[PDB]
From Swiss-Prot, chain A:
Organism lineage: Eukaryota, Metazoa, Chordata, Craniata, Vertebrata
Protein name: DNA-dependent protein kinase catalytic subunit
FATC domain location: 981-1013
Entry's localization field: Nucleus; Nucleus, Nucleolus; Cytoplasm, Cytosol
Record's comment on post-translational modification: Autophosphorylated at two clusters, the T2609 cluster and the S2056 cluster. Autophosphorylation induces a conformational change that leads to remodeling of the DNA-PK complex, requisite for efficient end processing and DNA repair.
Subunit description: DNA-PK is a heterotrimer of PRKDC and the Ku dimer (composed of XRCC6/Ku70 and XRCC5/Ku86). Formation of this complex may be promoted by interaction with ILF3. Component of the core long-range non-homologous end joining (NHEJ) complex (also named DNA-PK complex) composed of PRKDC, LIG4, XRCC4, XRCC6/Ku70, XRCC5/Ku86 and NHEJ1/XLF. Additional component of the NHEJ complex includes PAXX. Following autophosphorylation, PRKDC dissociates from DNA. Interacts with DNA-PKcs-interacting protein (KIP) with the region upstream the kinase domain.
Shown chain mapped onto the complete sequence: 3059 to 4128 of 4128
Domain PI3K/PI4K catalytic: 607-938
Encoding gene (name): PRKDC
Positions of post-translational Phosphoserine modification: 616, 706, 911
From Swiss-Prot, chain B:
Domain of life, per lineage: Eukaryota
Subcellular location: Nucleus; Nucleus, Nucleolus; Cytoplasm, Cytosol
Gene giving rise to this polypeptide: PRKDC
Disease linkage: Immunodeficiency 26 with or without neurologic abnormalities: A form of severe combined immunodeficiency characterized by reduced or absent T and B cells, recurrent candidiasis, and lower respiratory tract infections. Some patients show dysmorphic features, severe growth failure, microcephaly, seizures, and impaired neurological functions.
Processing and modification events after translation: Autophosphorylated at two clusters, the T2609 cluster and the S2056 cluster. Autophosphorylation induces a conformational change that leads to remodeling of the DNA-PK complex, requisite for efficient end processing and DNA repair.
Upper lineage: Eukaryota, Metazoa, Chordata, Craniata, Vertebrata
Residues of the full protein shown: 7 to 1071 of 4128
Residues recorded as bearing Phosphoserine in the entry: 799, 963
Protein name, entry field: DNA-dependent protein kinase catalytic subunit
Subunit and interaction comment: DNA-PK is a heterotrimer of PRKDC and the Ku dimer (composed of XRCC6/Ku70 and XRCC5/Ku86). Formation of this complex may be promoted by interaction with ILF3. Component of the core long-range non-homologous end joining (NHEJ) complex (also named DNA-PK complex) composed of PRKDC, LIG4, XRCC4, XRCC6/Ku70, XRCC5/Ku86 and NHEJ1/XLF. Additional component of the NHEJ complex includes PAXX. Following autophosphorylation, PRKDC dissociates from DNA. Interacts with DNA-PKcs-interacting protein (KIP) with the region upstream the kinase domain.
Modification N6-acetyllysine occurs at: 111, 742
Renumbered ranges of HEAT repeats: 282-317, 902-938
Length: 1013, 969
DNA sequence: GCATGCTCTACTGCTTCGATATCG
DNA sequence: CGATATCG
DNA sequence: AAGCAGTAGAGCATGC
């Protein structure tokens, strides 16, 4: 009797109406229907709806998330509307069918988890149970139907509150709900199910001291009923009980394995509880109990897929612990039993089988054939590039007929990895080593029934640039021959390609299609190629490439590459689709994920009679080709680069932002990755996607300045390039690379910071906001221009570190001016090696210069990017470990086994040249995954940098000064003051953000990285 | 305006200066009553009902709190005169104030003193209680005070002067009419009082019998002798006395004015005919004498009253000579020779023959079996009168258009009892019926229902005879449809006649002595297909490039057939969808097959799709569809066909085929919804400037979401929803002016918006879940929203220096433009659109004018694709501008101050991707004319002085033409 | 050619006032 | 002269 | 009876 009297006296006058009815009207209608004036309530709710529309109308179109917070309330508004209309009209007097229909449309129409926060959840569920209680009191099976509706909505609210990190509300609701689940049985077992699942999710967030106590709490609540006379009735109740109890025993035996004995020191009765179920004779006991419960679980829709998968992961981490039994049989058994069904996590769990077959060949390989025989073939499509290189490996015959099923059904995608694998495939002497020759010949025959794909690859090949291949040949011979001519057949096997492409003007006319400029350059290679065909065929000269040097000097003079047409490549200029020749079906499709239907696939129809050449370090070319489905598609071509590892890291991006769309707090801010696409047609030739009106970052920052700001920045003696290089030469005495080794003995920590500020002072700070006001001209849109750019840039600068990438200078960042997103490209170094194998090691994890700082004025740069980075890492380290195993089988996959990597560094502008001699070893595919697992499992990021710097630059002259630069000073940097291991997320990202901006680190770094701007 | 006058009425119910604001309050009530009739809009009609039903201002308490005053008498009278016209200005939404106005009229009978104020309260009172029919509310009209209080108002009142003494007898017969089940135990003394009152009022010695208590007592006698009708079965004493009462009440030769009592006696003997049955033998001669006298008194309502009393007496005479056929030979002989003498053929103009017609048609009945040969010359003589009297094609001087349904009912009633028809005059009879049903809209109410009963009577008559005659009814409706559809009265009074004949046959069957509506609906659908067969609707081009095909031929072959085709489709819309219950079973396949067989031959004729919409809507109104399979798969092949046919059309056909497409059953067509989703995409885009397609699109999205399985549609919500953001952003004046003096009331009796869609969109968007709604705003965030949110250049050129006398500041006269062009493209407002166009023309001239002494080719490309779509847009003024402007600039850009500056090739590519585009069809035609002008003045100037490396030359655009001719697009 | 709508108007009638027969 | 009708 | 107002009913051009 407190609020209704207040409102019944306050409802007078004008000033006690023009706020109180302008604002609410809806809870006003609610308390009015509590006092039962439905027509007054009808007026107030219609005013509520009209106020919703009027409040909607004045908002803008691009102010996001306020539209969403307004829009979510309309479910509640029309729920009150349906209730008042249902209780007014009385055809529902005693006929129960409107109650049945309303129960059905209530239990169908649900607010979803992971996008609706708990306040709106509370609003709609409180309104719904309140209206149901109103029907319960008004109109005096059916009430038990009402009670089941109430509890089902409540437990749904519980299981939605678990996912969105809101544990205390579910604690309070489960605490108030236990007195309800005593008239029934399944209510009680779902109560204890939700309890143990919530304690599971709490334990991952909890510390090890807290972990043991909460799991002792849930096993203490696992001493009650629901085992008697219902696990026989519902066998799935027994199954899920065994699942959860095995998960508890799993997590406690996980808990007493990280710290050796310190956890088993302080308890008395719970210490007796540990050992009643030494110090190893109960660890193995808990592991045996967990395996026994998981065995009963997999012994007893889609309620058993997870039961298989947890036992698979259990034995998998057991096997990884063993290398760092019948369990390798059991894991492949239940894993393929899972993958036969429609799964996704098992679809990402294929290289476990692909490596455990090689490691355990005697362990039931006939079972592997027999189980891989019975599988739908629309699954393996994403994992084809490993199985195509597996044919050279002995015992490649655990599956052949499903592979042939996939080829005979969908050959037009597998045609691209097969040329790459057949380029290097050498079998053995045994009879199974000739059956593999028979198999590769029969599938080379079952492929290329048309005989036009190879022709298309050739026609795309012969539009390239000849000087680039000339430099490639010169560096290849200077590498492989100038040391010692002990190499078998390599000089001829390289010279056959040099004579085929860019030889005489008629050998490409016979073995390929004559392009309209090989008659200008392969013809021009006649007189200096006569001596080439005379002596260069079998020279073994091993000393001399100055004749190659003077010819690459005088072969850049008349270099003209703009054909600007498709007379440059006369095959596709006159394509003119004729009939069924089993058409090409443009590469870049068949991602997997279900049954691919090629009737909707786009057929490559026409090409464009104009090309544009780019300005990069390889000068690529684009095409604007046109498909059968009436549109255009642009693409860029790249000749002489391997493009398989980049496809793998794009697949890694795909799986990690598959993880990002699963938990709550990152989904509610909609954080994704701009995943473009590559295709490796043959080795050293691939097609890359190109997106729409996209500017490089250095292009934007150069275009922003004035005409005189440009010349004062670049063409000046006080240029921060020239000033930095002049100061670094004067503080060294020398003039080239190696002065970055002379600087770390003879420079102090703070005077270098002042000299850094000297060049920081020159360039302005408002350049990014000047470029952002140059285009926007609207304070309504400036907010949603800045916010999306900052969000995306923080997300990519925190996902470019979990897998360690380096070499991020300004040209590797692509901003889309129409929307305001930023995406990075050009993955050079997959794990932490770009600071290892360079002369001067860059030590920052990612870019954070003064421009991202001075855009965030007047905020400190510790509020906006901080929240999204801590949400990123809290989303990362709560996984079963998919990213770990996928990175492991990526780096262990043979594609860059140090020779491809050194050839790739020669394929770019190579700062590193030679003098390796121990770097052939210390590649070490155990150390990289070990240290990535450390830097995911909690590690101070001043320790990982020291670890890889020691591993890469042991016995270097300037090493400890490098570590002392990247070590702190115990007063100026928090990283020297923070510990070295066992950290948490907020202090992790605090150490990381302080590590990023650190004016000793930005003092001495490579001048191409351009650290000032 | 409204309700402030009512608050002034509340402030002036007790304001000062008694007898000092009577004219203020009176002009207040008259001012509200003016604009309470001067609004033909139901929104304010729904407003004012809730206005007048209030308890603070208004009427219900103002009739109780403003009585004892001298300051406002005209106000008290004007409100009770205004309420009795607002009783029927609205409908019957005054039902929850039956008891409120009951205690109101108790209060104003008691407390008020005046009589000229007492009368209009009684007016609205009795008209309200007549407006109510026997139902719940009369049970709370307490007869214990309604009879007894107002009956002791008779008793405990002497010198009851005139106008309440009549009104109390009006009240007690009013409630005798409406729900007399409360009036069982108050019957005996009241009729004794009714005898004694008129006894002392008329049969006294020296008193002048004044009219009003006679009128009241006779109306009460009629309205109370009906519930307990007193025949020769109740009391054979007051039957005799009431008989002599009403007969002296219709005594002739009393020539006077104010003919209340004779018309009252006529209206009473209209009802009470069959009651005084055995006393209708006494003075039948003088009964007929006064009937023949007062039949032609030449007073306006007295004619109708006289003929109604006349036909009622003739009906009872025919009934008594029917049921008592033994002793009545003399009586039937007298009426026989009388009517044959009056039909004899001498000079009878429209009086003796007009009474001859009805009595002849009625007396066909009795003598039908005594002789059977005079019955044979019966209807032969009747045709030999009516055929010669009708159809003379006298353009000036034969308007017997008010006498017709009498003739029709008579010829039907004589057509009944015959057998073996002379059957030669039947193409005169059917011509008579089609003439009468043709000249139907120049009638009045209560003429129309008599005519409807007549035509239904004759259709019942000539359908029990034989199927040799059952095709006259088939052909007369065929002729009638092509008559009524020809004349563009336009067609809008035949519609409810066709409704009344087949629909409300069921209220005709009672008095008159099956499958009638079956037969008439079958005949109607047969006629509407046989008419639409023989029409030849084709169009022929008269003697540009037409690339549309609802194309530039505005001329069809027979233009007077298209009018009687669109009148056909509108009549079909108004009559068809009612009652698809049992009759519309078999025609679902054959009629649909016929319509598509015609429409496949010609696509571009609208209304065919409207016929298809009508038959598919009745097919969804019936169930019938749970799998003939022929017509199922026929619609399957038809829908995809029209859904790919409707692409390159224009608006007025697009709306019709969309109303077809989204009215498919389509819960039974579960497949290929990806071909229906561009139709529903275009439907809401063509909403918000046209209502009913935007209504039916939501009405069908409801059907989709509530009846289909929500898994195929579960990805198909990302492109239905996110377009919906636009939704959630006469003689009454002179018949009211000069008082409410009831002739103005007689002349009053002679004479879906967007916000409901807003409410329904919100109810839909709420009822369709939480997890689905989120895509509604997440559409692209990269389109012309952001392109209106981008600067059109890096730096701003075109600095404008406004002229002043001292200062002259500068203004960037380009910052207005992304609102200026979106305004001038479509303003949706005819006053501001022309101003936007003039401003934009001057702006374009200025931006050209600065260019003779900075680069703007980033701006020209953003400028021109609205200059084209406004040069050839819609209106005449926006065509007369921007067309010579675009010719001026295209000829300037094809010149020597031109000649290969990026601006010229920019203009060229602008008009070229003007040519190649999806559906904007007229634009491509316009820029084809532009490239023709380009081809003219480009090459018709330059001599070969530099005409060898000009990339603007026609060879380059020939290569461009080859490129456009070479695409799989 | 007719039903109807715009005026006229004189009957009717309504209130107001006042001069005379009937019974304690 | 005083309560109650009468009537133009 | 005096002052005076409503009002049915009859009459003159007009639309369909």
């Amino acid at each position: 009797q407190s609020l209704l009297t207040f409102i019944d006296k306050a409802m007078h006058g004008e000033l006690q109406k023009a706020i109180l009815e302008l604002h609410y009207s809806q809870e006003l209608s609610l308390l009015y229907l509590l006092q039962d004036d439905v027509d007054r309530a009808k007026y107030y709710i219609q005013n509520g709806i009209q106020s919703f529309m009027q409040n909607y109308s004045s908002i803008d179109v691009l102010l996001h998330q306020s539209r969403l917070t307004k829009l979510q309330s309309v479910q509640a508004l029309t729920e009150i509307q349906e209730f008042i209309s249902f209780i007014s009209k009385q055809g529902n007097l005693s006929s129960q069918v409107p109650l049945k229909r309303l129960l059905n449309t209530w239990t169908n129409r649900y607010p979803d988890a992971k996008m609706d926060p708990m306040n709106i959840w509370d609003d709609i569920i409180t309104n719904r149970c309140f209206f149901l209680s109103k029907i319960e009191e008004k109109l005096t099976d059916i009430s038990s139907l009402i009670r089941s509706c109430k509890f089902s909505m409540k437990m749904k609210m519980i299981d939605s509150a678990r996912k969105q990190n809101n544990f205390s509300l579910a604690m309070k609701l489960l605490k108030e709900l236990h007195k309800e689940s005593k008239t029934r049985d399944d209510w009680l077992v779902s109560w204890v199910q939700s309890y143990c699942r919530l304690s599971h999710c709490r334990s991952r967030s909890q510390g090890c001291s807290e972990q043991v106590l909460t799991v002792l709490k849930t096993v203490s609540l696992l001493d009650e009923n629901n085992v008697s006379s219902y696990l026989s009735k519902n066998i799935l109740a027994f199954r899920d009980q065994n699942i959860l109890l095995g998960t508890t025993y799993r997590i406690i035996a996980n808990a007493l394995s990280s710290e050796p004995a310190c956890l088993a020191e302080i308890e008395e009765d719970k210490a007796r509880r540990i050992l009643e179920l030494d110090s190893e004779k109960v660890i193995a006991g808990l592991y045996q109990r967990a395996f026994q419960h998981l065995s009963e679980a997999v012994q007893a829709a889609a309620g058993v897929i997870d039961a298989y998968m947890t036992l698979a992961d259990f034995c998998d981490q057991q096997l990884r612990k063993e290398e760092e039994q019948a369990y390798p049989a059991l894991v492949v058994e239940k894993m393929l039993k899972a993958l036969k069904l429609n799964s996704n996590e098992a679809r990402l769990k294929f290289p476990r089988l692909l490596q455990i077959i090689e490691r355990y060949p005697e362990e039931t390989l006939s079972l592997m054939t027999k189980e891989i025989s019975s599988v739908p073939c629309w699954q393996f499509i994403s994992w084809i590039s490993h199985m195509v290189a597996l044919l050279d490996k002995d015992q490649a015959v655990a599956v052949q007929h499903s592979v042939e099923e996939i080829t005979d059904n969908y050959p037009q995608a597998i045609v691209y990895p097969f040329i790459i694998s057949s380029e290097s495939y050498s079998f053995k002497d045994t009879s199974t080593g000739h059956k593999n020759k028979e198999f590769v010949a029969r599938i080379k025959s079952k492929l290329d029934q048309g005989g036009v794909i190879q022709d298309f690859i050739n026609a795309l090949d012969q539009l390239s640039n000849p000087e680039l291949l000339f430099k490639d040949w010169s560096n290849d011979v200077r590498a492989e021959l100038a040391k010692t001519p002990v190499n078998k057949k390599n000089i001829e096997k390289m010279y056959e390609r040099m004579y085929a492409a860019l030889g005489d003007p008629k050998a490409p006319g016979l073995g390929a299609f004559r392009r309209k400029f090989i008659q200008t350059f392969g013809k021009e290679f006649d007189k200096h190629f006569g001596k080439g065909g005379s002596k260069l065929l079998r020279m073994k000269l091993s000393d001399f490439n100055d004749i190659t040097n003077m010819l690459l000097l005088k072969m850049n003079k008349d270099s003209k590459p703009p054909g600007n047409l498709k007379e440059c490549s006369p095959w596709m200029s006159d394509f003119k689709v004729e009939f069924l020749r089993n058409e090409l079906e443009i590469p870049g499709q068949y991602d997997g994920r279900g049954k691919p239907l090629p009737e909707y696939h786009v057929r490559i129809a026409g090409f464009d009679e104009r090309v544009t050449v780019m300005a990069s370090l390889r000068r690529p070319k684009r095409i604007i080709i046109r498909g059968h489905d009436e549109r255009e598609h642009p693409f860029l071509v790249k000749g002489g680069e391997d493009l398989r590892q980049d496809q793998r890291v794009e697949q890694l991006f795909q799986v990690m932002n598959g993880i990002l769309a699963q938990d709550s707090a990152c989904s509610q801010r909609a954080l994704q990755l701009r995943t473009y696409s590559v295709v490796p047609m043959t080795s050293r030739l691939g097609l890359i996607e190109w997106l729409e009106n996209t500017v490089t970052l250095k292009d934007l920052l150069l275009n922003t300045m004035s005409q005189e700001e440009k010349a004062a920045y670049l063409s000046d003696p006080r240029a921060p390039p020239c000033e930095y290089k002049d100061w670094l030469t004067k503080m060294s005495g020398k003039h080239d690379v190696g002065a970055y080794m002379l600087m770390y003995k003879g420079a102090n920590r703070t005077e270098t910071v002042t000299s850094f500020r000297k060049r920081e002072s020159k360039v302005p700070a408002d350049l990014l906001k000047r470029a952002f006001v140059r285009m926007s001209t609207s304070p309504e849109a400036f907010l949603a221009l800045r916010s999306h750019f900052a969000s995306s840039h923080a997300l990519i600068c925190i996902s470019h570190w979990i897998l360690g990438i380096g070499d991020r200078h300004l040209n590797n960042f692509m901003v889309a001016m129409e929307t305001g997103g930023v995406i990075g490209i050009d993955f050079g170094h997959a794990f932490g090696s770009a600071t290892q194998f360079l002369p001067v090691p860059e030590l920052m994890p990612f870019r954070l210069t003064r421009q991202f700082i001075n855009l965030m004025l007047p905020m400190k740069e510790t509020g906006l990017m901080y929240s999204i980075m801590v949400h990123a890492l809290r989303a990362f380290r709560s996984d079963p470990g998919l990213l770990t195993n996928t990175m492991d089988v990526f780096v262990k996959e043979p594609s860059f086994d140090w020779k491809n990597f050194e050839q790739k560094m020669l394929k770019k502008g190579g700062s590193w040249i030679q003098e390796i001699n121990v770097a052939e070893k210390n590649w070490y595919p155990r150390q990289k995954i070990c240290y990535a697992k450390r830097k995911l499992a909690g590690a101070n990021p001043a320790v990982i940098t020291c670890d890889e710097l020691l591993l890469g630059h042991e016995k270097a002259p300037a090493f400890r000064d490098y570590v002392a630069v990247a070590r702190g000073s115990k007063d100026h940097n928090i990283r020297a003051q923070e510990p070295e291991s066992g950290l948490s997320e907020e202090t992790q990202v605090k150490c990381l953000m302080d590590q990023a901006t650190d004016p000793n680190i930005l003092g001495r770094t490579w001048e191409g990285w351009e650290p000032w701007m | 305006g409204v309700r402030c006058s009512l608050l002034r009425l509340q402030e002036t119910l007790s304001a000062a200066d008694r007898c000092g604001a009577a004219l203020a309050g009176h002009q207040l009530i008259r001012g509200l009553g003016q604009e309470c009739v001067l609004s033909s809009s139901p929104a304010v009609l729904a407003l004012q009902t809730s206005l007048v039903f209030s308890r603070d201002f208004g009427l219900l308490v103002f009739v109780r709190k403003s009585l004892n005053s001298i300051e406002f008498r005209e106000c008290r009278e004007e409100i009770l005169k205004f309420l009795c016209i607002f009783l029927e200005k609205m409908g019957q939404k005054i039902a929850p104030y039956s008891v409120e106005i009951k205690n109101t009229c108790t209060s104003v009978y008691t407390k008020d003193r005046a009589a000229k104020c007492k009368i209009p309260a009684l007016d609205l009172l009795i008209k309200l209680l007549q407006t109510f029919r026997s139902s719940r509310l009369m049970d709370e009209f307490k007869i214990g005070e309604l009879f007894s209080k107002f009956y002791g108002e008779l008793a405990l009142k002497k010198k009851i002067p005139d106008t309440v003494l009549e009104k109390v007898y009006e009240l007690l017969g009013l409630l005798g009419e409406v729900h007399p089940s409360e009036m069982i135990n108050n019957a005996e003394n009241l009729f004794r009082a009714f005898l004694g009152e008129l006894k002392t009022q008329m049969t006294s010695a020296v008193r002048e019998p004044k009219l009003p208590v006679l009128a009241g007592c006779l109306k009460g006698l009629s309205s109370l002798l009906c519930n307990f009708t007193k025949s020769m079965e109740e009391d054979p004493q007051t039957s005799r006395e009431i008989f002599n009462f009403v007969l002296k009440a219709i005594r002739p030769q009393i020539d006077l004015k104010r003919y209340a009592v004779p018309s009252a006696g006529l209206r009473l003997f209209a009802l009470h005919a069959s009651q005084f049955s055995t006393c209708l033998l006494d003075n039948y001669v003088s009964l007929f004498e006064v009937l023949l006298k007062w039949c032609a008194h030449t007073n306006v309502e007295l004619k109708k009253a006289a003929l109604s009393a006349l036909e009622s007496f003739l009906k009872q005479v025919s009934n008594m000579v029917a049921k008592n056929a033994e002793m009545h030979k003399n009586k039937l002989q007298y009426f026989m020779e009388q009517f044959y003498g009056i039909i004899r053929n001498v000079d009878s103009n429209n009086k003796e023959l007009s009474i001859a017609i009805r009595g002849y048609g009625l007396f066909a009945g009795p003598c039908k079996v005594i002789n059977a040969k005079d019955v044979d010359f019966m209807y032969v003589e009747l045709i030999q009168r009516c055929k010669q009297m009708f159809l003379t094609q006298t353009d000036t001087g034969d308007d017997r258009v008010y006498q017709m349904p009498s003739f029709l009912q008579s010829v039907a009633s004589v057509l009944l009892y015959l057998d073996t028809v002379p059957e030669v005059y039947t193409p005169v009879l059917e011509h008579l019926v089609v003439m009468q049903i043709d000249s139907f809209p120049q009638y009045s109410p209560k003429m129309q229902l008599v005519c409807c009963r007549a035509i239904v009577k004759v259709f019942l008559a000539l359908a029990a005879k034989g199927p040799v005659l059952r095709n006259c009814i088939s052909t007369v409706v065929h002729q009638g449809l092509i008559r009524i559809c020809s004349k563009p009265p336009t067609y809008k009074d035949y519609v409810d006649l066709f409704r009344h004949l087949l629909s409300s046959d069921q209220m005709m069957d009672s008095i008159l002595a099956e499958s009638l509506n079956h037969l008439l609906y079958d005949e109607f659908v047969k006629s509407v297909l046989k008419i639409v067969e023989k029409l030849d609707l084709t169009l022929e081009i008269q003697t540009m490039i037409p690339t549309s095909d609802p194309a530039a031929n505005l001329h069809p072959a027979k233009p007077k057939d298209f009018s009687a085709f669109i009148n056909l489709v509108e009549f079909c819309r108004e009559i068809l969808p009612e009652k698809q219950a049992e009759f519309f079973e078999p025609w679902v396949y054959s009629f649909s097959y016929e319509l598509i067989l015609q429409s496949t031959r010609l696509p571009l004729i609208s209304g065919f799709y409207k016929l298809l919409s009508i038959t598919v809507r009745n097919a969804k109104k019936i169930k019938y569809f749970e799998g003939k399979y022929s017509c199922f798969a026929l619609f399957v092949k038809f829908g995809k066909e029209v859904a790919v046919k409707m692409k390159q059309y224009k608006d007025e056909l697009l709306a019709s085929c969309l109303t077809f497409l989204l009215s498919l059953p389509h819960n039974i067509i579960e497949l290929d919804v990806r071909a229906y989703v561009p139709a529903l995409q275009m439907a809401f885009k063509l909403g918000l400037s046209y209502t009913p397609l935007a209504e039916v699109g939501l009405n069908a999205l409801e059907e989709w979401s509530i009846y289909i399985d929500r898994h195929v549609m579960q990805p198909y919500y990302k492109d239905i929803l996110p377009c919906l953001d636009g939704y959630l952003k006469s003689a009454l004046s002179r018949a009211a002016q000069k008082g409410f003096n009831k002739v103005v009331l007689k002349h009053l009796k002679k004479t879906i918006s967007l916000e409901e869609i807003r409410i329904r969109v919100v109810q839909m968007l709420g009822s369709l879940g939480g997890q689905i709604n989120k895509n509604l705003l997440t559409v692209t965030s990269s389109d012309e929203m952001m392109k209106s949110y981008v600067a059109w250049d890096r730096e701003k050129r075109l600095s404008f220096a406004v002229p002043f006398r001292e200062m002259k500041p500068v203004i960037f006269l380009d910052v207005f433009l992304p609102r200026v062009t979106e305004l001038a493209l479509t303003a949706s407002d005819r006053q501001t659109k022309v101003a936007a166009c003039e401003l934009l023309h001057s702006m374009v001239m200025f931006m050209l004018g600065k260019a003779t002494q900075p680069p703007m080719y980033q701006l020209y490309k953003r400028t021109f694709p609205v200059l084209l779509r406004l040069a050839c847009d819609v209106d005449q003024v926006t065509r007369q501008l921007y067309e010579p402007l675009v010719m001026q600039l295209i000829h300037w850009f094809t010149n020597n101050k031109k000649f290969e500056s990026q601006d010229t090739v920019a203009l060229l590519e602008a008009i070229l991707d003007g040519i190649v585009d999806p559906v904007d069809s007229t634009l491509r035609d316009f820029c084809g004319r532009c490239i023709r002008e380009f081809l003219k003045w480009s090459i018709k100037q330059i001599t070969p002085q530099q005409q060898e490396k000009s990339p603007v030359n026609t060879k380059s655009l020939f290569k461009r033409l080859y490129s456009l001719a070479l695409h799989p697009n």
